Amino acid sequence: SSSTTLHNAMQYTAFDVLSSILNLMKADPLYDLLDQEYEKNEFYGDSYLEERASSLVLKFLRKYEQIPFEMYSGLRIHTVKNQTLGEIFDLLHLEKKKKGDLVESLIGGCVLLSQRENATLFLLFAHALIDYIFYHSSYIYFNANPPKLVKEEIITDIQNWFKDKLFYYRSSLEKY
Amino acid sequence: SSTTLHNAMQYTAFDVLSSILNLMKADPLYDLLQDQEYEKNEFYGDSYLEERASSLVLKFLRKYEQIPFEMYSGLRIHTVKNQTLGEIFDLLHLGDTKTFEKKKKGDLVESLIGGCVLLSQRENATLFLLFAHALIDYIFYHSSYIYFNANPPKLVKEEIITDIQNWFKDKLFYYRSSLEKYQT
């Protein structure tokens, strides 16, 4: 057993949990609140994704001095680029340019709506979406760009973190 | 008007930020700031500044329908560019005896923000988070004041500058009150 063993399961369970948070959002009164408000959510979501992705890049890579700094910038770029957001768009059933814009404005609108209306469910979805974006990107990026000696370790680190996030989002969601 | 107390904004910002920075330098965790740890702080600080600046742009500009969306990216870009960060570097006298170009000053500001934020996340060193937020808030006040005087929005120029200036006044008092807790 290795990081490939349960990779497919990450995809299915991420689909289960995110589809289930999104459907309970579509049942929330505030869901409509998502003037160019679309562009403003996109403006903010772009920056929110960037900071959160950067934080996650640092969290996992700094543990391994085998990993040069170029891989920090590389993974961040790989994680937030339109192709990756577009892949996530398709997988979750929500070209590459407008899908990414949609993903960014969806992140931004959820975070802002949670700040403005104390609607923690929308913040939960935003964090869950970004975590899946990051797992999806990392798994692909490190298979294409294996770090020296620690490729399986760091993917396993990220995969096991994402396993626990998926359970946490399932646990957090039951309260709604 | 907003022009009356602008000069005053800069002296008290210098007072409060210098005082937080000196408490930081007397902190045991200060050494853990300043392998490529510097570029990793800059890497993170760049994005942390970007999100907080975007959040502040939205907080103030959304109140005024007179303000078109172009000024959102316009103000954000103006706020995080190296020229702006270098001005804040100079105002805070962060490298008085040294020889940095605009680009290196901006780099330093980003890595200082990032290093403070990461240290507060890792060690619960709330003082370093306090400084990071105060620095970003001054960057935003400094940028907004120049940007809206250069690009006066229709009808609301004085209103929004007054809005940001009064918010920054209160933040500065908040940082003074917060830092008193560390000296005691």
Side-chain angles (χ1 to χ4, degrees), chain A residues 40 43-44 51 72 76, chain B residues 40 43-44 51 72 76:
Chain A
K40 285 163 197 177
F43 165 90
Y44 181 65
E51 184 276 336
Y72 289 64
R76 178 173 65 190
Chain B
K40 287 165 198 178
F43 166 90
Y44 182 65
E51 184 277 338
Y72 288 60
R76 176 172 63 192

Side-chain angles (χ1 to χ4, degrees), chain B residues 32 40 48 82 92 119 150 154 178 184:
Chain B
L32 312 168
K40 287 165 198 178
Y48 192 89
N82 279 324
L92 300 171
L119 178 60
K154 181 166 183 327
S178 297
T184 82

Side-chain angles (χ1 to χ4, degrees), chain B residues 1-6 9 59-60 63-64 137 140-141 144-145 158-174:
Chain B
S1 76
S2 65
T3 307
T4 309
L5 294 183
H6 174 63
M9 298 306 108
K59 162 186 176 68
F60 290 105
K63 309 181 197 171
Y64 302 99
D137 286 350
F140 182 77
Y141 168 75
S144 292
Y145 186 86
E158 185 62 12
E159 286 63 27
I160 189 173
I161 296 179
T162 293
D163 220 324
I164 299 169
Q165 199 183 73
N166 289 344
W167 162 87
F168 189 53
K169 290 179 201 176
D170 287 347
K171 290 316 287 268
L172 290 171
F173 287 110
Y174 161 79

Side-chain angles (χ1 to χ4, degrees), chain A residues 1-94 96-176:
Chain A
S1 99
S2 74
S3 67
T4 68
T5 308
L6 297 181
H7 174 62
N8 283 348
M10 302 302 111
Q11 178 209 294
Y12 311 144
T13 310
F15 181 94
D16 300 334
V17 178
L18 282 169
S19 293
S20 299
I21 299 168
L22 177 65
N23 287 330
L24 288 209
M25 278 166 31
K26 292 179 181 184
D28 206 283
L30 312 165
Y31 184 82
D32 292 326
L33 311 175
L34 294 324
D35 279 324
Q36 297 159 284
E37 193 170 341
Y38 173 87
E39 296 78 340
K40 285 163 197 177
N41 289 330
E42 181 181 350
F43 165 90
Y44 181 65
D46 178 9
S47 75
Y48 192 89
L49 171 58
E50 192 87 22
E51 184 276 336
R52 194 136 200 284
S54 302
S55 176
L56 290 165
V57 170
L58 270 175
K59 165 185 178 69
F60 290 105
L61 275 63
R62 75 183 183 106
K63 169 186 198 179
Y64 298 102
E65 331 285 350
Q66 288 83 357
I67 298 191
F69 175 72
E70 296 75 56
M71 294 210 265
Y72 289 64
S73 173
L75 176 58
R76 178 173 65 190
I77 293 165
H78 190 276
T79 296
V80 310
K81 66 182 185 191
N82 281 322
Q83 181 189 299
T84 295
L85 302 189
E87 288 161 358
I88 289 286
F89 187 95
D90 297 335
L91 291 172
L92 297 176
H93 298 116
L94 301 178
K96 154 197 119 183
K97 241 290 190 194
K98 293 179 179 179
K99 289 171 173 172
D101 297 341
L102 195 297
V103 172
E104 287 173 356
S105 54
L106 177 57
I107 288 169
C110 292
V111 176
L112 293 163
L113 181 58
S114 79
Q115 293 168 356
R116 289 162 186 169
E117 306 304 334
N118 297 284
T120 50
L121 183 68
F122 290 80
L123 188 59
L124 193 72
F125 178 75
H127 287 179
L129 183 55
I130 293 171
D131 285 350
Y132 182 29
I133 290 164
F134 180 78
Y135 171 77
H136 171 88
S137 168
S138 291
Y139 187 90
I140 290 160
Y141 175 89
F142 285 125
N143 267 289
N145 307 279
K148 295 180 182 297
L149 298 168
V150 304
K151 178 207 176 272
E152 183 61 10
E153 282 167 68
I154 189 175
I155 294 183
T156 294
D157 283 346
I158 298 166
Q159 200 184 74
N160 288 345
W161 161 88
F162 193 52
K163 290 182 201 177
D164 288 346
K165 293 316 287 267
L166 290 172
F167 285 108
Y168 165 99
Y169 290 130
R170 178 69 193 77
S171 183
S172 296
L173 153 69
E174 192 72 10
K175 289 55 193 144
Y176 298 93

Side-chain angles (χ1 to χ4, degrees), chain B residues 49-61 63:
Chain B
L49 171 61
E50 191 84 21
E51 184 277 338
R52 287 285 95 214
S54 301
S55 175
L56 291 167
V57 168
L58 275 200
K59 162 186 176 68
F60 290 105
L61 272 62
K63 309 181 197 171

